[PDB]
Design an enzyme around this catalytic site. Structure first.
Site, PDB file in Angstrom:
ATOM      1  N   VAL B  18      31.937  62.316  44.808  1.00  0.00           N
ATOM      2  CA  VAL B  18      33.239  62.708  45.115  1.00  0.00           C
ATOM      3  C   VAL B  18      31.890  63.451  46.162  1.00  0.00           C
ATOM      4  O   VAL B  18      32.712  64.456  46.963  1.00  0.00           O
ATOM      5  CB  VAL B  18      33.723  63.949  44.359  1.00  0.00           C
ATOM      6  CG1 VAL B  18      32.712  64.887  43.679  1.00  0.00           C
ATOM      7  CG2 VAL B  18      34.830  64.662  45.367  1.00  0.00           C
ATOM      8  N   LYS B  38      25.157  53.237  48.400  1.00  0.00           N
ATOM      9  CA  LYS B  38      25.080  52.370  47.371  1.00  0.00           C
ATOM     10  C   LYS B  38      24.462  51.827  47.133  1.00  0.00           C
ATOM     11  O   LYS B  38      24.653  50.662  46.514  1.00  0.00           O
ATOM     12  CB  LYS B  38      26.365  53.027  46.557  1.00  0.00           C
ATOM     13  CG  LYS B  38      26.400  52.350  45.132  1.00  0.00           C
ATOM     14  CD  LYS B  38      26.572  54.186  44.745  1.00  0.00           C
ATOM     15  CE  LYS B  38      26.366  53.651  42.678  1.00  0.00           C
ATOM     16  NZ  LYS B  38      26.399  55.314  42.238  1.00  0.00           N
ATOM     17  N   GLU B 109      23.888  56.779  47.411  1.00  0.00           N
ATOM     18  CA  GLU B 109      24.101  57.153  45.753  1.00  0.00           C
ATOM     19  C   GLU B 109      23.576  57.095  45.184  1.00  0.00           C
ATOM     20  O   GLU B 109      22.985  56.000  45.172  1.00  0.00           O
ATOM     21  CB  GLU B 109      25.429  57.623  46.197  1.00  0.00           C
ATOM     22  CG  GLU B 109      25.619  58.435  44.903  1.00  0.00           C
ATOM     23  CD  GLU B 109      27.316  58.519  44.307  1.00  0.00           C
ATOM     24  OE1 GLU B 109      27.511  58.592  42.783  1.00  0.00           O
ATOM     25  OE2 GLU B 109      28.595  57.941  44.661  1.00  0.00           O
ATOM     26  N   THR B 146      23.786  72.902  31.412  1.00  0.00           N
ATOM     27  CA  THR B 146      23.270  72.369  32.622  1.00  0.00           C
ATOM     28  C   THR B 146      21.799  73.255  33.547  1.00  0.00           C
ATOM     29  O   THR B 146      21.324  72.775  34.407  1.00  0.00           O
ATOM     30  CB  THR B 146      23.911  73.322  34.515  1.00  0.00           C
ATOM     31  OG1 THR B 146      24.716  72.335  35.273  1.00  0.00           O
ATOM     32  CG2 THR B 146      24.709  74.368  34.357  1.00  0.00           C
ATOM     33  N   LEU B 147      21.662  74.642  33.090  1.00  0.00           N
ATOM     34  CA  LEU B 147      20.168  75.265  33.594  1.00  0.00           C
ATOM     35  C   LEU B 147      19.029  74.421  33.426  1.00  0.00           C
ATOM     36  O   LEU B 147      17.949  73.715  34.786  1.00  0.00           O
ATOM     37  CB  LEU B 147      19.820  76.501  33.112  1.00  0.00           C
ATOM     38  CG  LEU B 147      21.301  77.348  33.437  1.00  0.00           C
ATOM     39  CD1 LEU B 147      20.799  78.893  32.568  1.00  0.00           C
ATOM     40  CD2 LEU B 147      21.002  77.649  35.068  1.00  0.00           C
ATOM     41  N   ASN B 148      19.773  74.034  32.343  1.00  0.00           N
ATOM     42  CA  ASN B 148      17.876  73.176  31.690  1.00  0.00           C
ATOM     43  C   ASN B 148      18.001  71.727  32.742  1.00  0.00           C
ATOM     44  O   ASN B 148      16.606  71.387  32.813  1.00  0.00           O
ATOM     45  CB  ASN B 148      17.853  72.598  30.158  1.00  0.00           C
ATOM     46  CG  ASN B 148      17.182  71.728  29.773  1.00  0.00           C
ATOM     47  OD1 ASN B 148      15.371  72.130  29.282  1.00  0.00           O
ATOM     48  ND2 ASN B 148      17.493  70.644  29.502  1.00  0.00           N
ATOM     49  N   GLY B 170      29.647  69.785  41.206  1.00  0.00           N
ATOM     50  CA  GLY B 170      30.653  68.795  40.605  1.00  0.00           C
ATOM     51  C   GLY B 170      32.026  68.864  40.834  1.00  0.00           C
ATOM     52  O   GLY B 170      32.698  68.474  41.586  1.00  0.00           O
ATOM     53  N   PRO B 198      36.296  72.053  43.702  1.00  0.00           N
ATOM     54  CA  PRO B 198      37.582  72.112  43.080  1.00  0.00           C
ATOM     55  C   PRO B 198      37.158  70.886  42.243  1.00  0.00           C
ATOM     56  O   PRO B 198      37.389  70.054  42.673  1.00  0.00           O
ATOM     57  CB  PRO B 198      38.617  72.497  43.727  1.00  0.00           C
ATOM     58  CG  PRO B 198      38.257  71.649  45.409  1.00  0.00           C
ATOM     59  CD  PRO B 198      36.705  72.139  45.726  1.00  0.00           C
ATOM     60  N   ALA B 201      39.642  67.502  42.786  1.00  0.00           N
ATOM     61  CA  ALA B 201      38.969  66.969  44.605  1.00  0.00           C
ATOM     62  C   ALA B 201      39.208  65.106  44.445  1.00  0.00           C
ATOM     63  O   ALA B 201      39.840  64.900  45.015  1.00  0.00           O
ATOM     64  CB  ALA B 201      37.419  67.222  44.823  1.00  0.00           C
TER      65      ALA B 201
HETATM   66  C1  LIG Z   1      36.665  60.227  34.793  1.00  0.00           C
HETATM   67  C2  LIG Z   1      36.649  59.930  36.777  1.00  0.00           C
HETATM   68  C3  LIG Z   1      36.218  60.424  37.827  1.00  0.00           C
HETATM   69  N1  LIG Z   1      36.439  60.206  38.783  1.00  0.00           N
HETATM   70  C4  LIG Z   1      35.459  60.864  39.832  1.00  0.00           C
HETATM   71  C5  LIG Z   1      34.778  62.650  39.422  1.00  0.00           C
HETATM   72  C6  LIG Z   1      33.254  62.799  39.994  1.00  0.00           C
HETATM   73  O1  LIG Z   1      33.510  63.988  40.720  1.00  0.00           O
HETATM   74  C7  LIG Z   1      33.134  61.746  40.960  1.00  0.00           C
HETATM   75  C8  LIG Z   1      31.886  61.214  40.714  1.00  0.00           C
HETATM   76  O2  LIG Z   1      30.644  61.028  39.816  1.00  0.00           O
HETATM   77  P1  LIG Z   1      29.501  60.820  39.347  1.00  0.00           P
HETATM   78  O3  LIG Z   1      28.610  61.262  39.657  1.00  0.00           O
HETATM   79  O4  LIG Z   1      29.348  59.959  41.041  1.00  0.00           O
HETATM   80  O5  LIG Z   1      29.273  59.595  38.216  1.00  0.00           O
HETATM   81  P2  LIG Z   1      29.664  57.929  38.725  1.00  0.00           P
HETATM   82  O6  LIG Z   1      31.122  58.122  37.729  1.00  0.00           O
HETATM   83  O7  LIG Z   1      30.859  57.240  40.372  1.00  0.00           O
HETATM   84  O8  LIG Z   1      28.935  57.157  38.000  1.00  0.00           O
HETATM   85  P3  LIG Z   1      27.526  57.144  39.000  1.00  0.00           P
HETATM   86  O9  LIG Z   1      26.727  57.448  38.423  1.00  0.00           O
HETATM   87  O10 LIG Z   1      27.074  55.762  38.808  1.00  0.00           O
HETATM   88  O11 LIG Z   1      27.674  57.732  40.208  1.00  0.00           O
HETATM   89  O12 LIG Z   1      34.280  60.584  40.273  1.00  0.00           O
HETATM   90  C9  LIG Z   1      36.832  59.129  39.320  1.00  0.00           C
HETATM   91  O13 LIG Z   1      37.010  59.069  40.562  1.00  0.00           O
HETATM   92  N2  LIG Z   1      38.093  58.781  38.543  1.00  0.00           N
HETATM   93  C10 LIG Z   1      37.522  58.954  36.771  1.00  0.00           C
HETATM   94  O14 LIG Z   1      38.423  58.391  36.060  1.00  0.00           O
HETATM   95 MG   LIG Z   2      28.978  57.707  41.703  1.00  0.00          MG
END
Ligand SMILES: Cc1cn([C@H]2C[C@H](O)[C@@H](COP(=O)(O)OP(=O)(O)OP(=O)(O)O)O2)c(=O)[nH]c1=O
Ligand SMILES: [Mg+2]
Ligand SMILES: Cc1cn([C@H]2C[C@H](O)[C@@H](COP(=O)(O)OP(=O)(O)OP(=O)(O)O)O2)c(=O)[nH]c1=O
Ligand SMILES: [Mg+2]
EC number: 6.3.3.3
Lengths: 226, 227
Positions: B18, B38, B109, B146-148, B170, B198, B201
């Protein structure tokens, strides 16, 4: 001196304390004298007390600490909340150095992960390990994300020549399952897995904990620690 | 060339996807051409497709994949479970370098955190950022630990001379609450917090995602990314 090991972790609540207990217990059963130092304990308002857990699970009596903050926060935030500064680097280092003696396994637990602030100003468990020339045992999960966190922690140790004594999986699930099985095999490719404590071990009584502890580690590796 | 940013995180599920979509949306609304990339996608058998989400939320059409695996596992284990190999390091580099263009912002990413193996053997997103001289945007939580993790990630970046373009939170809750608020204060003492997205998002529609995105980053920082 003797052998000093900091017991760090890839994060918060990964099993550092139950791993100190487990290694303390196996060491004692091998006839080694054991001390454990937890310089900063937080969350004391709700009764957090990692030294009490070690004393009760493994039987250790030489248990040293310097500060107790009531809030359940990381040491620096808890100290900021209280308005009372964390101990200083020298305090912590001299406490551990006074504990250490030949024939003694001395374990040191900080809080959370390797880089959280343990003493004023900004000094970490990695700094303490450097000052007392300790090696590091790294407690890990077998859950999603563990390899990255393990690798990041292992690099941070090597960056200050803090030796890695092994990994411990602080909580091993029953039965493993697909991710946990894959994660354990991969951790074993990057460092020795000294032990994988079964989940819930920290609630065992002292008798069960001791038998579990002596079966969890390799007899010779424990014997050779000191 | 243009500007390449690897978008990494302190782990998986912290908001990397996101954040890409938000930075891409804000970059586009500044007039900046955006590509997003990606190179390794796992979990296709569960429907996971970060490129597709970035296209949805932001309207980006310049989306480049390479390696895809059915199982929701770490790349090494997912490719293994599928009888496939990881891509080679030069294929990841080729993917990115083909998209690089003057005046274009390219976002790359990773999979999970900084040191996840993305290529045979033990090749990570950090190695890749070195190969294409990219800086790194670090997506973090405001939750406990998160800090560590953030400090560990920043150290791994500096040891290979990978510049850090800042932090992004995030998922940022409304209201903040004490745990998150304290962590955000402590993260800003460590590095620049470029945005706090937020919570939720990823469910906004394109209209609202673009509004959120334009508000979440400083426009002068976004525009200064790309000559
Ligand atoms: C749980 C959940 C999260 N998200 C969102 C919330 C996060 O802000 C966003 C990105 O998190 P990312 O860090 O991108 O992790 P990911 O799940 O995409 O896996 P990867 O490490 O391969 O990237 O995805 C969804 O779109 N659908 C869902 O069901
Ligand atoms: Mg991702
Ligand atoms: C249920 C539960 C138990 N414990 C107990 C069981 C674990 O096996 C044991 C050791 O894990 P630790 O990593 O030491 O957890 P902690 O809160 O003591 O960690 P820290 O000192 O950094 O705050 O503590 C938790 O820490 N957290 C929990 O949520
Ligand atoms: Mg503990």
């Amino acid at each position: 001196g003797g052998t000093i090991l900091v017991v760090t972790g890839t994060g918060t609540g990964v099993g550092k304390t139950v791993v100190c207990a487990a290694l303390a217990s196996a060491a004692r059963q091998a006839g080694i004298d054991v001390a454990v130092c937890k310089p900063v304990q937080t969350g004391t308002a709700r009764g957090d007390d990692d030294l009490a857990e070690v004393g009760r699970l493994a039987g250790v009596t030489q248990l040293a600490g310097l500060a107790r903050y009531p809030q359940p926060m990381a040491p620096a935030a808890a100290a900021e909340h209280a308005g009372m500064a964390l101990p200083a680097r020298d305090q912590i280092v001299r406490l551990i150095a006074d504990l250490d003696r030949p024939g003694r396994l001395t374990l040191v637990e900080g809080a959370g992960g390797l880089l959280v602030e343990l003493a004023e100003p900004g000094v970490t468990l990695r700094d303490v390990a450097v000052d007392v020339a300790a090696a590091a045992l790294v407690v890990v999960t077998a859950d999603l994300g563990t390899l990255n966190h393990t690798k990041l922690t292992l690099e941070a140790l090597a960056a200050q020549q803090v030796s890695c004594a092994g990994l411990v999986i602080g909580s091993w699930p029953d039965p493993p399952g697909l991710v946990a099985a894959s994660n354990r095999s991969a951790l074993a490719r990057i460092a020795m897995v000294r032990a994988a404590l079964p989940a819930g071990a920290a609630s065992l009584d002292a008798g069960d904990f001791a038998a579990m502890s002596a079966a969890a580690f390799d007899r010779n590796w424990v014997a050779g620690l000191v």
